[PDB]
UniProtKB/TrEMBL annotation:
Belongs to the bacterial solute-binding protein 1 family. Keywords: Signal, Transport. This is ABC transporter, periplasmic substrate-binding protein. Pfam families: SBP_bac_1. The keyword Signal applies.
């Protein structure tokens, strides 16, 4: 009978690919259906390019794709409309914001699978050691704490010790980190939901200059090549006071044999001042049935299973990834394992989106402009003032004649 083939997540990032393959194999065993897992590269933008090869070919060789929150507007032609397959009551079990994000010109492109938001990981043991009682609320405080803890840990002999790690590589992950910097300085959303390209302002420029000032000082020089896992590995080995990353890093840091198990907490990222908005970039992944799948019925069944209460529960408990079902945030087992899901729920609800709705199918070009200009500041090639002006000009060219 049919073989249902899935491309989603990556064995190169944490446990997500291994866990995805496991969930797909469980469905195949439960239903008596043959399945195959196709692995993907680590970085989202690399996955998009890979999957676009299949889509350009109208290839039947993948039935189900795990797609990024930033993609519906790009991938919609390649998605089977799921709306007719779900009742209104079934669809209401997901966060409406994400269902809306995944709905493009009426087509429900994909089911919400897990959500995501950028957060601050902090070493609680080190804060205590150096006399700090709370994680930093401002970027200035983050810098001051990192300098002091770094000075002390270096003097005690840890050559590998840094104050802060984050994603500074030129790829989509840096657009995520940079939105957070800019928004948390009161510099706006780069491109506003109304279409206004707002990034050429002094607050955005200051945000980028500040981030440059970390490189080689409180963050490793090599941070400009770090994606999620490079940051996580310095952190997880016990070599960074602070890290910006997503929820998945938490369960991995708590695993038996982690050097940092029991030594960290999480909180909202810091911001420029008390009246700036909190910034947590919205992430998350969705489950799409290919428009080119020969087996839409079986594929939809697998997608419903993956997005079900019990599979999302397993994702939350074992992988610390955020459900897209509000009911799971009150589940006793979810919360006992990850209490911070409750503490940070308002951070997740107020997460700031990248400009994927307003850029639509041009989002990947916009993001590439953003990450390359931001990177030029991190590498010291340009100051923030020049980079935001240049970025404005680039985005204006990219979105000229685009209406939303
Ligand atoms: O494969 C899922 C896995 O990818 C991550 C990053 O490792 O996804 C987040 O980061 C991306 C940028 O690098 C965002 O585009 C995406 O929206 C966001 O979810 C993990 O957090 C996630 O478990």
């Amino acid at each position: 009978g049919p073989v249902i083939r899935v491309a989603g997540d990556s064995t190169a990032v944490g446990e997500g690919g291994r866990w995805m393959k496991e969930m797909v194999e469980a469905w195949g065993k439960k239903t008596g259906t043959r399945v195959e897992y196709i692995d993907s590269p680590a970085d989202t933008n690399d996955r998009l390019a890979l999957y676009q090869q299949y889509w350009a070919a109208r290839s039947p060789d993948v039935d189900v794709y795990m797609i990024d929150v930033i993609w519906p507007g790009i991938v919609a032609p390649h998605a089977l409309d799921l709306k007719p397959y779900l009742t209104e009551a079934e669809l209401k079990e997901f966060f409406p914001r994400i269902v809306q994000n995944n709905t493009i010109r009426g087509k429900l492109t994909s089911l919400p699978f897990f959500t995501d938001a950028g957060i601050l990981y902090y070493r609680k043991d080190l804060l205590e050691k150096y006399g700090y009682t709370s994680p930093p609320r401002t970027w200035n405080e983050l810098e001051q704490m990192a300098e002091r803890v770094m000075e002390g840990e270096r003097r005690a002999g840890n050559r590998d010790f840094w104050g802060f790690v984050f994603q500074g590589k030129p790829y989509e992950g840096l657009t995520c980190d940079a939105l957070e910097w800019i928004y948390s300085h009161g510099g706006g959303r780069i491109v506003e939901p109304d279409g206004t390209i707002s990034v050429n302002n002094g607050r955005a420029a200051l945000a980028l200059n500040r981030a440059h000032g970390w490189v080689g000082r409180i963050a490793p020089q090599g941070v400009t090549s770090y994606a999620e896992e490079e940051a996580r590995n310095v952190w997880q080995q016990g070599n960074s006071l602070f890290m910006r990353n997503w929820p998945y890093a938490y369960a991995l840091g708590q695993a038996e044999g982690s050097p940092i198990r029991g030594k960290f907490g999480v909180t909202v990222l810091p911001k420029a001042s008390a009246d700036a908005p909190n910034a947590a970039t919205l992430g998350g992944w969705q489950l799409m049935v290919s428009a080119y799948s020969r087996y839409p019925k079986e594929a939809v069944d697998l997608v419903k299973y993956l997005a079900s209460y019990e599979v999302q529960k397993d994702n939350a408990v074992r992988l610390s990834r955020l459900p897209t079902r509000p009911a799971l945030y009150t589940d006793r087992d979810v919360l006992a394992r990850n209490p911070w899901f409750r503490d940070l729920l308002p951070v997740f609800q107020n997460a700031v989106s990248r400009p994927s709705d307003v850029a639509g199918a041009r989002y990947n070009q916009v993001s590439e402009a953003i990450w390359t200009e931001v990177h030029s500041v991190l590498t010291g090639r340009k100051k923030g003032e020049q980079a935001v002006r240049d970025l404005e000009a680039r985005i204006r060219r990219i979105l000229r004649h685009h209406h939303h």
